Write a protein that binds this DNA or RNA. Sequence first.
RNA 1: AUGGGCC
RNA 2: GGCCC
Length: 476
Amino acid sequence: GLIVDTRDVEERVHVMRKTKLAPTVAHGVFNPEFGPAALSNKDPRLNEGVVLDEVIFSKHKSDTKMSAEDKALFRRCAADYASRLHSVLGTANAPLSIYEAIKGVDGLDAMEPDTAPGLPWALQGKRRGALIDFENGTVGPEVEAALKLMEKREYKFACQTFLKDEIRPMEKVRAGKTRIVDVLPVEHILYTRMMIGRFCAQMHSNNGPQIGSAVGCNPDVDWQRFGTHFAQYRNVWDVDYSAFDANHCSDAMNIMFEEVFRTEFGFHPNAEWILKTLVNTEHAYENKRITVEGGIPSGCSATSIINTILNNIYVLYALRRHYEGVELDTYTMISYGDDIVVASDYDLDFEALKPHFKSLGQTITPADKSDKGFVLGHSITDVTFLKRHFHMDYGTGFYKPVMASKTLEAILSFARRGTIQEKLISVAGLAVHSGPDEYRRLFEPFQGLFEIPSYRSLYLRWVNAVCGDAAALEHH
RNA sequence: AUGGGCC
RNA sequence: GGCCC
Ligand SMILES: [Mg+2]
Ligand SMILES: [Mg+2]
């Protein structure tokens, strides 16, 4: 978004730490073009004269402003999408109890007991268990006091910046393109869950093309559902954004929140108010305090669902800004945050749509880059969604999420000390869809050192997961 | 080092 | 704990 202020405060918030990721035996063998993200300025792998802390805020280039006519247009799309959405989810969106916000419900995971609390708790050595009782689902004085404030709508907060200790393409490491997480205070997360926790549960349970969202899906078993759905259309588009999160303009955010979370849909009046506190935020990084306008704080605030809803409304608004008579049935789409798959039988011109996404401050481009702009005819077996391809399992005939072996190799070449065993059994679950031969190759560097799940066991597990009867069929 | 999914 | 946004 738009960085309006850049002040320097005396007290300092720490981030620059060492990476917990370490090279495994696989690394020496596979030799991936991947590595831990740069977390320091003194990182020897960084390109000369490349200032880390400067490349982290280079995503905030502007809070694009919309005219009155586009705003009224956007509002129309938001209300149309809100309509479909709640039409499918229902309208039992009353607040959750504090107990229910902490433990969650069906469709909603409980809160994480041992993660960061945000500010200003980080300036007091307090963990999450020190503020909240994740057992009995209870909160302490500070929190409760903070809840009243939020009830009063007089709550003020700041985001704590964290560099993401993940593996990335070496090109992005060297370019110091480490991604960051805007850790919000723990009370904010909780209150958000109270205000919109039921809604999020419903979204997770109802994931699919109908609501245009994959949040809460399980690739292993939903690829079949999503795959058959999309192979059903003439055109399919793998659309990429750049800085989706950052490029949400206040206009757009403010209109979605107003349109999707109205009290008539069952929401407590504070739902709209809490979300709106994500627009203009103050971000604390070491000795720096940075006030930003526009953009959704990445990681802490039903971030995925908000990013997904917006994505749906962006597509409907672009199409409508270019074509006449466009409705939600004109096309079909599933998204997960910024990740998106769009499909239609009309020769929709996504090359012409670019400017219209620009009118929102968003930059769309084809996934398959080598191709000059968006083409037509592409089928679902060409796109990526959630870093997985849609391939046909020749054993069952079901679609299966296949990850690129280069990616898998990367994942297997770095690990957090003392978790290699768990991680493997975890990655095996993903590798099984590559096939027997690839599966063997991938884990070969680990054989005789860890327990590698057999291809057969994970395969049988999958077949049942995806379609229990298909398993029974193989027995009749 | 996180929101949220999925194991 | 691990992956995916
Ligand atoms: Mg502004
Ligand atoms: Mg994609």
